[PDB]
Design a protein around this nucleic acid. Structure first.
Lengths: 97, 82, 326, 51, 191, 209, 44
RNA sequence: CGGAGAGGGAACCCACU
DNA sequence: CTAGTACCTAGCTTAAGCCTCAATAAAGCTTG
């Protein structure tokens, strides 16, 4: 708090529908303490392993299988931020997911 | 300094006016003899105001010059602002 | 176009705390004569002030291995007709910035020859072909030396303009005070609208020491630079002007009494006494007085160590002891 | 900013010499406001003989 | 000079380490293999022109062990012998760096792919092909609710409980008579 | 590149001559305000390997009250002047009956020469100036007010009038451009006449420390 | 949290094996591994 | 018996102008 | 044997100290 950098305190564009734009304390906690929108829900977490077994069986390749020759034209898959594999057809896998 | 060499203003400044009135009305509150015939008013501050207006306050002001010297200005002798 | 002048509380901080590095140091350079009247000579003064490196004018840079300078691996009949190291350097400029800043290949080559001596020879194409080529050799740690000198020459060469002034603006002022004001033969004031130019850097000394630049009116908006160039009394006036600028920018009024008193007490010691613990505690006011402000440990131990005596002639000194402050 | 300004000028006052001196009697102005005049008793005026 | 070298300050490492040294320590002796993990299409010379200033910084390390030694020398706990720095830096690369991509016997290829992706992401921002990520973008934020907060705090208290069950066990097994886990467990600490 | 250097040297000479006039030394109006053409015809347009070269373009002047104290100025050819290149000027200092002089250097003077100028200062009160610094007369600037050097008797009159001691005055450091321009030791107060937007004109006194 | 995260925290903790002071005269250990947390309703 | 009233403190949090 | 209680142990800025680099005069060759 009591910091002259107003950038964190400002209402960000990505607060639409997840954080109340109006509701915030007027003291030294403007924008730092923010409440929650009505239908805004916070994910609780689950194991990504079923997603992993589902992913590994359509047409994608793990890192160990392929060479970086064919990695430039295809698309990189991240699961919880870890680079799991590579897929040649982004479309119809997005639709499948 | 001598009476000939008086370089300070002949006007009684607001601070002198406040402090002289306070310290004279305090004396009146401690039953000091009044210098002006009163008409039944009992408040020492109003008594001191009347004495100041009549120019009868038995007090002089020592104005210290910055160099260290001083001047003795009698309340009766310098001009009251109000 | 340059209203990032950081007015308000930040400028008040930059003035009170006299900072070596303000966020927006800028000039208000005025012009002397016919250059102040017409725009072309104003642009001529502008280009002599705006700092220009050789990065600003070149399009791309490439190096080759030509075994023979006569061979001309690149098809250029100019080198054929013009004509000892095989590893050469080639840079392509653009006509746009070239004719914007009014340089010549001869000027660029003589700048190179003066900066680096006769350690290299520049072979420049004439100002007739569509392409703007100058080739660089090294006369007799072989080509990485050429790589490093290429980087050094692109980074800082000062083809035109003076250092530390990056961008300079040019406009006709609308406010009467910033406009030149004269007196006619019938005692009028006849507000004149002449060309002025503002910068985004500050030198204040290589600027006024330039032809056709008015060295009578050029303020620099930089208190420390004014202190270095013009002296403490000019500092007081310039500081007053900059301190009044922020207050009167809002349209509000503050009596000159207070501005004069502040600029006096900030400059009554011959040096720029910035109002911090670095300027207020340095003056010999008294350990008790200066142990009420951003202090009260270092000051007190220093006073105990040096046996300093507090005359108790201040206000915050008599206040501590429960005495009538003067 | 206000506190820092006050702590740098808190002892500057008009002496009975009518000059302006700090706590150590160093002269800041020979007359207050370089005229010796109170700031609460002045007005805005126009100089007729000017322009 | 040369300009635009790429460094990677690493956890439990006092100084920054050039990325190519990191890859060689991770196990890639060659240079083409390392560049295969950063620039995915070799026909883009703009990427090469900015990656070679970092390549020519580290043409004195050619094998895995010298790079391990180089990292260990910069470690917070510098080993006295070569084979101690080797093990310390190997442990750092195995567990401290990039845990989420895997900590197992052989995860070097996956860690190298992810680190080369990180370098590629840095180069994309340097060339302007992409744009800098926003810190206030609440896509980049996560919310620690009662669940995650109590998990973070219970994990530490549970470790503290274990490291006192261990002390009680040591105090009884130094004499070696016997021990009781009921007395060993200090139910006070967690609650 | 000789027109620019000739113009630069002409402005340096003009500023130095104005400096001498303000300091009190005797200068004729003809040399006080001469155009660039007179400088061209009197020195030679060719600072690079030509007749308008330094060292015999230097100026010597004398004070108005008595033509005994005299003030040279010197423009060394060396960019960074040194002891051996100022001991010659000191030898001229001694061979003449002169007391003080100026040195307008081309680039920054060396610290050894600065320490020398400090060391023989009481015998010979000579000071330095920069080529860059003397291309403008700073007193002509609108921010710089009218500075007037007080004589000792009127300094004593000022102190006796205001009943204040020598160190209570506002002060000015000797290193700032205006005090260096006039040329004045410590313990020498300067009248400073400046216009007041509140009441007309205001006189302030800065002492050198 | 109380369903799965406490379970994973209590299970992923490594077992502790502990020896004597390296000898007695001129030492075996144990594992003590635990799992399968149980949680009951508030009691007083 | 006398009217005794003097009644810790640090930390953090929220809030008011 | 155990309990109860009594004794032991986020950024800014600016000076300010600390790290390296270029003239320079003594110290001694060096040949005129």
């Amino acid at each position: 708090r009591d910091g002259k950098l107003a950038k964190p305190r400002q209402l960000h564009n990505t607060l639409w529908g997840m954080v109340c734009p109006a509701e915030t304390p007027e003291g030294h906690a403007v924008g730092l303490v923010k409440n929650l929108a009505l239908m805004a829900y916070i994910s609780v977490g689950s194991q990504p392993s079923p997603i992993l077994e589902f992913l590994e069986e359509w047409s994608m390749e793990n890192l160990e299988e392929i060479s970086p020759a064919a990695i430039a034209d295809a698309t990189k898959i991240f699961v919880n931020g870890c680079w799991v594999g590579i897929h040649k057809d982004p479309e119809q896998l997005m639709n499948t997911l | 300094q001598a009476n000939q060499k008086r370089i300070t203003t002949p006007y009684m400044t607001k601070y002198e006016r406040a402090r002289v009135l306070g310290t004279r009305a305090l004396q009146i509150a401690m039953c000091a003899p009044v210098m002006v015939e009163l008409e039944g008013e009992t408040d020492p501050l109003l008594i001191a105001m009347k004495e100041l207006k009549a120019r009868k306050i038995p007090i002089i002001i020592r104005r210290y010059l910055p160099d260290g010297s001083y001047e003795d200005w009698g309340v009766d002798e310098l001009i009251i602002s109000d | 176009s340059a209203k990032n002048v950081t007015l308000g509380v930040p400028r008040l901080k930059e003035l009170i705390n006299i900072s070596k590095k303000p966020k927006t140091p800028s000039l208000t350079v005025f012009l002397l004569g016919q250059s102040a009247r017409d725009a072309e000579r104003a642009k001529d003064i502008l280009c002599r002030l705006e700092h220009t490196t050789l990065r600003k004018v070149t399009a791309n840079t490439a190096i080759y291995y030509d075994p023979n300078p006569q061979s001309t691996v690149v098809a250029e009949d100019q080198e054929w007709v013009n004509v000892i190291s095989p590893w050469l350097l080639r840079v392509e400029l653009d006509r746009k910035h070239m004719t914007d800043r009014k340089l010549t290949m001869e000027q660029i080559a003589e700048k190179i020859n003066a900066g680096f001596g006769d350690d290299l020879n520049c072979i420049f194409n004439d100002d007739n072909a569509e392409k703007l080529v100058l080739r660089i050799r090294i006369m007799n740690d072989d080509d990485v030396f050429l790589r490093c000198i290429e980087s050094n020459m692109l980074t800082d060469m000062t083809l035109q303009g003076i250092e530390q002034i990056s961008k300079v603006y040019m406009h006709l002022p609308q406010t009467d005070n910033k406009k030149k004001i004269i007196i006619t033969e019938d005692g009028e004031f006849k507000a004149l609208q002449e060309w002025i130019l503002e910068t985004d850097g500050v030198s204040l000394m290589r600027v006024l020491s330039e032809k056709d630049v008015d060295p009578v009116r050029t303020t620099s908006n930089d208190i420390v630079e004014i202190f270095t160039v013009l002296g403490i009394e000019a500092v007081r006036k310039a500081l007053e002007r900059e301190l009044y600028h922020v207050i009167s920018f809002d349209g509000s009024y503050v009596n000159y009494r207070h501005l004069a008193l502040l600029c006096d007490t900030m400059t009554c010691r011959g040096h720029l006494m910035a109002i911090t613990r670095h300027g207020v505690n340095r003056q010999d006011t008294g350990p008790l007085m200066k142990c009420s402000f951003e202090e009260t440990v270092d000051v007190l131990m220093e006073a105990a160590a040096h046996g300093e005596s507090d005359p108790m002639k201040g206000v915050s000194e008599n206040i501590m002891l429960g005495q009538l402050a003067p | 900013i206000q506190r820092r300004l006050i702590k740098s000028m808190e002892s500057v006052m008009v002496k009975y010499d009518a000059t302006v001196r700090n706590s150590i009697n160093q002269v800041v102005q020979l007359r207050y406001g370089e005229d010796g005049l109170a700031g609460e008793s002045v007005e805005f005026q126009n100089l007729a003989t000017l322009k | 000079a040369i300009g635009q070298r790429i460094v990677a300050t690493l956890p439990y490492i006092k100084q920054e380490v050039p990325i190519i040294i990191v890859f060689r320590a991770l196990g890639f002796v060659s240079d083409r293999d390392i560049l295969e993990h950063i620039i995915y299409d070799f026909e883009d010379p703009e990427m090469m022109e900015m990656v070679k200033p970092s390549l020519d910084e580290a043409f004195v390390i050619q094998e895995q062990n010298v790079a391990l030694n180089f990292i260990g020398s910069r470690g917070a706990k510098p080993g006295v012998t070569k084979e101690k720095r080797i093990k310390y830096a190997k442990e750092v690369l195995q567990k401290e760096m990039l845990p989420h991509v895997g900590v197992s016997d052989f995860c070097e290829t996956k860690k190298a792919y992810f680190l080369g992706y990180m370098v590629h992401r840095l180069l994309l921002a340097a060339l302007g092909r992409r744009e800098l990520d926003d810190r206030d973008h609440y896509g980049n934020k996560r919310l620690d609710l009662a669940g995650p907060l109590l998990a973070f705090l219970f994990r530490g208290m549970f470790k503290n409980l274990l490291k006192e069950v261990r002390i009680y066990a040591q105090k009884f097994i130094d004499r070696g008579k016997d021990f009781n886990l009921e007395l060993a467990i200090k139910t006070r600490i967690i609650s | 590149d000789d027109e620019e250097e000739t113009y630069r040297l002409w402005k340096i000479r003009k500023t130095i001559m104005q400096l001498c006039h303000d300091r009190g030394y005797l200068v004729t109006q003809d040399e006080l305000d001469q155009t660039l053409e007179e400088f061209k015809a009197q020195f030679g347009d060719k600072p690079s390997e030509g007749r308008p070269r330094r060292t015999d373009l230097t100026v010597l002047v004398a004070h108005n009250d008595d033509p005994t104290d005299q003030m040279f100025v010197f423009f060394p050819e060396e960019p960074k002047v040194g002891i051996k290149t100022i001991k010659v000027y000191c030898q001229r200092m001694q061979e003449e009956n002169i007391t003080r002089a100026l040195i307008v250097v081309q680039q920054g003077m060396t610290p050894s020469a600065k320490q020398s100028l400090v060391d023989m200062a009481p015998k010979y009160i000579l000071e330095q100036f920069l080529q860059q610094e003397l291309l403008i007369n700073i007193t002509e600037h609108e921010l710089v007010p009218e500075h007037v050097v007080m004589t000792k008797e009127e300094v004593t009159e000022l102190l006796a009038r205001y009943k204040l001691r020598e160190n209570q005055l506002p002060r000015i450091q000797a290193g700032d451009p205006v005090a260096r321009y006039f040329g004045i030791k410590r313990g020498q107060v300067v009248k400073i006449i400046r216009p007041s937007e509140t009441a007309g004109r205001y006189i302030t006194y800065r002492l050198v420390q | 949290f109380i369903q799965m995260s406490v379970q994973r925290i209590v299970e992923d903790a490594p077992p502790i094996d502990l020896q004597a002071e390296a000898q007695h005269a001129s030492p075996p250990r144990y594992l003590l591994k635990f799992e399968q947390i149980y949680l009951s309703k508030p009691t007083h």
